[PDB]
Design a protein around this ligand. Structure first.
Ligand SMILES: [Zn+2]
Ligand SMILES: [Zn+2]
Length: 82
């Protein structure tokens, strides 16, 4: 059991992961804060991303479908050069 909500203010700050570039393909929230649900079924090119809010939502597109699965991405993992 888990569920959280928030508006649009002082969001980008010590509290939740701020994913830049990734936008929710459900509501349209970008950047995506918190956990970024990245589809697993979809290809690496047509990879989708849903916000924790739209994590329990169902979206079906040309490629994406309801059967497809989603991966809860808490923190963003990259090269972190430097
Ligand atoms: Zn959303
Ligand atoms: Zn998919």
């Amino acid at each position: 059991g888990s569920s959280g909500s928030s508006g649009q203010q002082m969001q980008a700050e010590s509290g939740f992961v701020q994913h830049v570039g990734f936008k929710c393909d459900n509501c349209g929230i970008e950047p995506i804060q918190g956990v970024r649900w990245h589809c697993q079924d979809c290809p690496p090119e047509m990879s989708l991303d849903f916000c924790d809010s739209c994590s329990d939502c169902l979206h079906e597109t040309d490629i994406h479908k309801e059967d497809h699965q989603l991966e809860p991405i808490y923190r963003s993992s990259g090269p972190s050069s430097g």
